[model samples]
Target: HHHHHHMVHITLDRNTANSWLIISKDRRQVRMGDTHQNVSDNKERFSNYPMVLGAQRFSSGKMYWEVDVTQKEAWDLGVCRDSVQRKGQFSLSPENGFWTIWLWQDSYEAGTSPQTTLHIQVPPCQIGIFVDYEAGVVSFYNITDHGSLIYTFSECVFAGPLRPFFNVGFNYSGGNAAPLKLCPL
Candidate 1:
């Protein structure tokens, strides 16, 4: 239907799953458990951020996946370098090694400095992330709207391996009931 098979399946990396996040038994879903975990001060575990990296790593070619964020008002998902820093609270910006898009406070935003607000006429229930390493482009699409282009980060450079990253807010306000599920398709 499309130019390529962009709907690749990816599973959550249990080790990288934030201590505050509850990873599904199948290792493909993640959501808030209850309270912050009593993690043993592991730097890899996002102590302050509610995010997780994908189990698979990629350095080149097109890699993509679809995330279902239904029943949730807030969530973030995109690509991140395996070498990205993992200490303290951080910005989800490309310069910071994280290129993520999030829906928060009734607004869609790309994780850029000053927080770029994306004007999407229709809210995206499922988001598709497509990354082209050689082209140095990371694009987001609205899967429910026939894969319309939502945003794109051009001239993107990855210093190390890349993986899909996700966050469903870290406040644990009982609002994020729906897990950030990676569609198997």
Candidate 2:
């Protein structure tokens, strides 16, 4: 068998039976096993606090990261207005006193109305997060760019996983939408 430490392989995208296995770079060992035991549950159930695989907390500093939404439903990629700031979660809302990543359908000054499409890129290859909730800023960078800022939210620190999540959501304000895919390097 061979050995590697620069690659990770995981299985995801199953509507009937949600389950995933994270493999190391060598492709010979299992690092972590992520399985969604509940298959019939709707993705919206986690809207309040979505869960993802391979998420790591950040107190300070930077890391590389990237996410591919090419296969996700257009509407599912936008920001949520009903989101409330979790006690220990990050936020940017002045009322909440935490930092968050607010993704808008249009301009940052726009109202809280949900949109149908939003295009945001996670930079580098390693996902790095700097949480200074008090500063009202959350930045995402590209791993290849030496942690260059790819996206930032000024007043929203919605609690959710920060790892490369697979599967696109189909919850559209009007009708059903398509799923998104994740392309990791």
Candidate 3:
């Protein structure tokens, strides 16, 4: 399970992604659907957040991957613990089984309880996720420029294997409809 560009391969777990969310034929791309119908998930699904888990899981090693979010106005992508809460309301934070970054409309920030808002002219079209499980570090980067550090969760405690995570909520006014694709890298 590896990609040519970065030697790290991960696909969007079809069963984990919201049924209403549009997943690509190869199961590597995911997008927000215009409609937010009644999608069901009893395991590893976002209770209220629009997101998806990776098909593969990692326990250790420094794994790196890139997500092509070109033209996407709003989306979330990061790593989630395999033991992450699947049912009910789940918080998106390092202390809550998730370490991710997201963009809504035009704002960007880390998924902390209080949230750490970021200041950037434009969100990274292609983002990179670097995880050093052994070192307890999970970092996000702006891969469009080779490697520009976005955020890092240092001293993160990974009690279990981690699965890549993604989020893209649909809007009623038909805005923020861009897809967050897993680039072949």
Best by TM-score: 1
Instruction: List TM-scores for all candidates, in order.
Output: 0.92, 0.34, 0.87
- Range of the 10 consecutive residues with the lowest summed lDDT in candidate 1: 1-10
lDDT of each: 0.82, 0.32, 0.78
Per-residue alpha-carbon lDDT of candidate 1 for residues 12-75, written as tens digits (9 for 90 to 100): 8877777777788888888887776665556677667788899888887887788898878788
lDDT of 3 by residue, 1-185 (tens): 22124458788887776657878888888887766656665565565667789888998778888888887667778898887876667668888888898887678899877789876554578888888889998888786755667788888888899999888766655666778877775
What is the TM-score of candidate 2?
Answer: 0.34
TM-score ranking from best to worst? 1, 3, 2
List where candidate 3 sits over 4 angstroms from the true fold.
1-6, 36-41
State the displacement of the C-alpha of residue 134, model 2, in Å, after optimal TM-score superposition. 12
User: Which candidate leads the pack in lDDT?
Assistant: 1
Model 1 ranges off by over 4 Å: 1-4, 37-39, 171-173
Predictions: Cα RMSD each: 1.8, 10.5, 3.2
Task: Report backbone clashes per prediction.
Answer: 0, 34, 1
